[PDB]
Design a protein around this ligand. Structure first.
Ligand SMILES: CCCCCCCCCCCCCCCCCC(=O)OC[C@H](COP(=O)(O)OCCN)OC(=O)CCCCCCCCCCCCCCCCC
Ligand SMILES: CC(C)CCC[C@@H](C)[C@H]1CC[C@H]2[C@@H]3CC=C4C[C@@H](OC(=O)CCC(=O)O)CC[C@]4(C)[C@H]3CC[C@]12C
Ligand SMILES: O=c1ccn([C@@H]2O[C@H](COP(=O)(O)OP(=O)(O)O)[C@@H](O)[C@H]2O)c(=O)[nH]1
Ligand SMILES: [Mn+2]
Ligand SMILES: [Mn+2]
Lengths: 124, 118, 497
C-alpha cells in the first residue's frame, strides 16, 4: 500500500511551462510503476503518460514530445513536465501506482492506487 | 606364461622352398623379441634371424625373410633356394625384456623355447 | 556503464580465444610438417623411463606398467622406478613391479638428496638391468632426483620421459615426445597431452573437457612461440644436459626461508625457461590419467595449483625477458590471466551491489554464448558431440575455483578444516545472500514493459537450456554412452580380476 500526494498546478498563460509532482510513500517506490491520468470536465478520464520501474517512458497520442516525465528515487517522487501546452489540455490530473499487472496499462482498472488529484486552469 | 607352438617340415630337395609358422599363446607386450634357431645334427644351436614385435628386423644374408602378422599372434619365416647343409632342426624362441632391454643373440637369454620342425 | 563493461569483456575474451585458436592451429600444422619428414623406424636418440608413485592403487600401477611395456619405441636404455616407500605397506608396489618386470629391487637406507655423495653409484651398480628403488617417504621432489641420478650413469642416454604411476601410455607415446627434441637444438623439453579416461561423474565429465581444451589451446599457443610453462605431470620429456644443469637449483629452492613441496612441475619448467631454452608441446602424444570425483578434493587440488601458479608467476615474469623477442606472449598471457581474474571479481561485485535485472540477464546471455562458441569449437576440433557438455563448466568453475584462488591468495602470508573450506563456505553464503537480495529487490511483475519481458524471457530460456542439458546428461549416464572406450576396457578387466 502506497499513499500518493500531489503538489503544484495553477493558472498560467498559453504556451508556458508547468510542472506537477506526485509523491508516493511506501516500502519501496523503485519497484512501483507510475502513471498520470487527466479527467476533462465533460469527458471521461484518459491516459496521459506512464513510467515503469526500469525507467521506460510511455506517451499517449498528441503528447509524444510536449509532455516529459521523469522519476527520482532519492526523494521517492515522480514529476511531469508540460511544454507548449494548449488551452484544450486543461483538466484535473491524477497520479496512479501499480506493482503487478498484465499487458494492459491504459485502463483505469489496471492501476489500483489513485491520488486526490490537482486541477489546472489555463487561459488563452 | 607364453607357450610357443609351431608347425611345418618335411623332406625337400635342394631345389624348392618351404614355409614356417610359429604361434604364441599369450601376450607379447609389444616389446618382446622372438628369434628362430636351427640345430644341425652333432652341433649347437645357431642364430638365424630375429625381429622385435613392434618392428625392425635382424638376419644372419637376405636369403631368409621375416614377417609378422601382428593380428593373430603368428609370424612366418619364408625360405628359398635351400642347400643340403641348410636342413636342420629349427626352433622357435621368445625373449623377455623384463630383465633388460638390450638385444642379444645368445640362446641362454631366451627362455620361452619351442620344439623341432624337422 | 555496465553495457560497455560486459561488451568489452566479451569482445576481449573472444578475441583472445580466437588468437589462441589460430596459434594452436599454426603450431599443429608446423608439428605435422615436421613429422611428415620423419624417417621410418626413427630411433637415433636414447630415452629412459622414470616412474614415481606413492599409495597407488594396484590395478592402476599394473596398467601403467603394462602400458609402458607396450611402447613401440626401439631405443630404451632402461626403466627406472623410484618409490618413496621403505615401509611394510609400500612393499605392494615392489611386488607389483616384480610381477611385470625383473626382481632387481633395491631398498637403500639413505636418501640421495640428503646424502653427502649425490652420485647414485653407492646404491646402484648395474645400468643394463632395470632397477627399482625404495626410499624413505620424503616427497615427489626426492623421487625424481633419484631417477635423474640413475639416468646419468651412462653417456648413451640423451633424454628421459617422466611418467606418473597413474598414466596409461599409447604405443607411440614415447616416440612422439622424443622426436621434437632432435628437431631443433634449442628444444630441451617436450610436453605431452593428458586426457581424463573416467567420465562416470559430472565433475570428471567437465574436467576431461577442461583438460582437453587447455592442452589443445593454451599449451599449443605457448608452444607456437616455444614458451610453455608446464610440460604436464602425467606426460613429459626432458633432456639429460638441462636436468644435470638445473638439478641443484630445483632441490635447493628457497622462497621465504622454507623449502617448498608443491609446484613439482611448474618449477621445473620455470627453471628450464630461465636458461633461455625452448619448450615445444605436441598433441600427437596421448596420455590417460584419472581425475578426482570429490568436490572437496577438487577444491583442494585447485587451491594447491593456484598457490603454485601465483608463486611461480613472479619468476616467469622475471625470466621472460631473457628470451628477447620471445616471452612477450608469455608475459601478455600472465597479464591477461591477472586482469581477467580482477575483472571477473569486479563485475561480480558490481552485479551484487547493483542487482539490476537487465545487467544480470545480459551478462548471463553473453557468458552462455561465449561458452557455447567454445563448446562448438571443441566439438569441431575433437569431432565428438560430447564437447557440448562444456556449458556446465561455468557453474563448477564459479563455485570451486574462485574460492580456491581466494584461499591461495590469503594463505600466502577444526583449525585445519577452517584453513581449507571455510573460505569456500563464506563465498557460497555470500553468493546466496546476493541472490536473495537480488530476487527480493526485484519482486514485481510488469508485463507492459519491454525490458522486463526481455529479461524474463532470457532467464527462462537460460533455465530451460540448463534443464535440457542436465536431462541429456542424465539420459546419457543411464545409457553409459558418455563412457570413454578406454574406461569400459578397464571396467571389464577389473570385473574379470
Ligand atoms: C503462453 C506461453 C507461455 C508464456 C510464458 C511467459 C508468459 C507467462 C504469463 C504472462 C502473462 C501474465 C499473466 C500471468 C499470471 C500469473 C502471474 C501473476 O500475475 O503473478 C506474478 C507474481 C505475483 O505474485 P504475488 O506476489 O503473490 O502477487 C499477487 C497479487 N495478487 O509476481 C511476481 O512477483 C513474480 C515475479 C518474481 C520476480 C522475478 C523478477 C526477476 C528476478 C530475477 C532474479 C535474478 C537473480 C540473479 C542473481 C545472480 C546474478 C549474477
Ligand atoms: C534463491 C537462490 C538459492 C538462487 C541464486 C541464483 C544465483 C545467485 C546463482 C545461480 C547460478 C549461478 C551462475 C552460474 C554461471 C555463471 C558464469 C560466470 O562467467 C563465465 O562464464 C566465465 C567463463 C570461463 O572463463 O570459464 C559468471 C557467474 C555465473 C553467471 C553464476 C552467477 C550466480 C548464479 C546466477
Ligand atoms: O607424496 C607424494 C604425493 C604424490 N605423488 C605422485 O604424484 C602424482 C600425482 O599426484 P596426485 O594424483 O595426488 O595429484 P596431481 O599432481 O596429479 O594433481 C601421482 O603419480 C602420485 O603417485 C608422489 O609421488 N609422492
Ligand atoms: Mn591414482
Ligand atoms: Mn594424478
Amino acid at each position: 500500500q502506497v499513499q500518493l500526494v500531489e503538489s503544484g498546478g495553477g493558472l498560467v498563460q498559453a504556451g508556458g511551462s508547468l510542472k506537477v509532482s506526485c509523491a508516493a510513500s511506501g516500502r519501496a517506490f523503485k519497484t512501483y510503476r507510475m502513471a498520470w491520468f487527466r479527467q476533462a470536465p465533460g469527458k471521461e478520464r484518459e491516459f496521459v503518460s506512464g513510467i515503469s520501474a526500469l525507467e521506460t517512458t510511455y506517451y499517449a497520442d498528441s503528447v509524444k514530445g510536449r509532455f516529459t516525465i521523469s522519476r527520482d528515487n532519492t526523494k521517492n517522487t515522480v514529476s511531469l513536465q508540460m511544454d507548449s501546452l494548449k488551452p484544450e489540455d486543461t483538466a484535473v490530473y491524477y497520479c496512479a501506482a501499480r506493482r503487478y499487472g498484465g499487458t494492459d496499462y491504459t485502463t483505469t482498472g489496471s492501476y489500483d492506487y489513485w491520488g486526490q488529484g490537482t486541477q489546472v486552469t489555463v487561459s488563452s | 606364461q607364453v607357450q610357443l607352438v609351431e608347425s611345418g617340415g618335411g623332406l625337400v630337395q635342394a631345389g624348392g622352398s618351404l614355409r614356417l609358422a610359429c604361434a604364441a599363446s599369450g601376450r607379447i607386450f609389444s616389446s618382446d623379441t622372438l628369434a628362430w634357431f636351427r640345430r644341425a645334427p652333432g652341433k649347437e644351436r645357431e642364430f638365424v634371424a630375429a625381429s622385435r614385435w613392434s618392428g625392425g628386423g635382424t638376419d644372419y644374408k637376405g636369403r631368409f625373410t621375416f614377417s609378422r602378422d601382428n593380428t593373430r599372434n603368428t609370424m612366418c619365416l619364408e625360405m628359398n633356394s635351400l642347400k643340403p647343409e641348410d636342413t636342420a632342426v629349427y626352433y622357435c624362441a621368445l625373449r623377455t625384456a623384463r630383465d633388460s632391454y638390450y638385444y642379444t643373440r645368445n640362446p641362454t637369454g631366451y627362455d620361452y623355447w619351442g620344439q623341432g620342425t624337422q | 556503464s555496465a553495457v560497455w563493461g560486459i561488451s568489452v569483456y566479451g569482445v576481449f575474451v573472444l578475441g583472445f580465444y580466437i588468437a589462441q585458436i589460430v596459434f594452436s592451429e599454426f603450431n599443429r600444422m608446423r608439428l605435422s610438417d615436421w613429422i611428415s619428414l620423419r624417417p621410418d623406424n626413427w630411433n637415433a636418440t636414447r630415452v629412459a623411463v622414470i616412474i614415481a608413485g606413492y599409495r597407488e592403487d594396484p590395478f592402476m600401477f599394473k596398467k601403467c606398467l603394462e602400458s609402458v611395456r607396450d611402447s613401440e619405441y626401439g631405443n630404451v636404455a632402461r626403466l627406472i622406478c623410484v618409490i618413496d616407500g621403505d615401509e611394510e605397506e609400500d612393499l605392494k608396489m615392489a611386488e607389483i613391479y616384480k610381477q611385470v618386470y625383473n626382481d632387481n629391487v633395491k631398498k637403500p637406507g639413505v636418501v640421495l638428496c640428503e646424502s653427502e655423495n649425490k652420485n647414485g653409484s653407492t646404491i646402484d651398480s648395474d645400468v643394463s638391468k632395470n632397477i627399482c628403488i625404495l626410499q624413505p617417504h620424503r616427497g615427489k621432489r626426492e623421487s625424481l632426483y633419484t631417477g635423474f641420478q640413475l639416468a646419468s650413469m651412462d653417456p648413451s642416454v640423451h633424454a628421459v620421459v617422466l611418467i606418473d604411476s597413474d598414466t596409461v601410455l599409447e604405443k607411440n607415446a614415447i616416440l612422439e615426445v622424443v622426436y621434437p627434441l632432435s628437431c631443433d637444438p634449442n628444444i630441451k623439453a617436450v610436453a605431452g597431452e593428458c586426457k581424463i579416461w573416467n567420465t562416470d561423474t559430472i565433475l570428471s565429465m567437465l574436467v576431461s573437457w577442461r583438460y582437453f581444451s587447455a592442452f589443445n589451446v593454451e599449451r599449443g599457443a605457448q608452444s607456437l612461440w616455444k614458451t610453455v610453462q608446464c610440460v604436464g605431470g602425467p606426460l613429459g620429456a626432458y633432456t639429460i644436459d638441462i636436468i644435470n644443469e638445473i638439478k641443484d637449483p630445483w632441490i635447493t629452492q628457497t622462497f621465504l626461508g622454507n623449502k617448498c613441496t608443491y609446484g613439482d612441475d611448474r618449477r621445473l619448467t620455470n627453471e628450464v625457461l630461465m636458461r633461455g631454452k625452448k619448450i615445444v608441446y605436441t598433441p600427437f602424444a596421448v596420455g590417460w590419467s584419472d581425475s578426482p570425483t570429490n568436490v572437496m578434493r577438487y577444491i583442494v587440488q585447485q587451491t594447491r595449483w593456484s598457490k603454485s601458479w601465483c608463486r611461480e608467476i613472479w619468476y616467469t615474469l622475471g625470466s621472460a625477458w631473457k628470451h628477447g623477442f620471445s616471452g612477450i606472449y608469455l608475459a601478455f598471457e600472465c597479464m591477461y590471466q591477472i586482469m581477467y581474474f580482477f575483472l571477473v571479481m569486479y563485475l561480480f561485485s558490481y552485479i551484487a551491489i547493483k542487482a539490476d535485472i537487465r545487467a544480470q540477464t545480459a551478462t548471463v546471455l553473453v557468458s552462455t554464448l561465449v561458452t557455447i562458441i567454445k563448446s562448438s569449437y571443441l566439438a569441431l576440433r575433437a569431432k565428438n558431440l560430447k564437447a557440448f557438455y562444456f556449458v556446465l563448466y561455468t557453474y563448477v568453475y564459479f563455485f570451486c575455483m574462485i574460492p580456491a584462488r581466494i584461499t591461495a591468495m590469503f594463505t600466502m602470508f577444526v583449525w585445519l578444516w577452517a584453513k581449507q573450506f571455510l573460505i569456500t563456505y563464506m563465498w557460497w553464503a555470500g553468493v546466496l545472500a546476493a541472490g536473495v537480495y537480488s530476487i527480493v529487490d526485484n519482486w514485481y511483475f510488469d508485463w507492459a514493459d519491454i525490458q522486463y519481458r526481455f529479461a524474463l524471457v532470457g532467464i527462462c530460456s537460460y533455465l530451460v537450456f540448463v534443464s535440457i542439458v542436465l536431462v541429456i546428461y542424465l539420459i546419457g549416464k543411464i545409457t553409459t554412452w558418455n563412457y570413454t572406450p578406454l574406461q569400459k576396457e578397464l571396467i571389464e578387466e577389473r570385473y574379470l580380476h
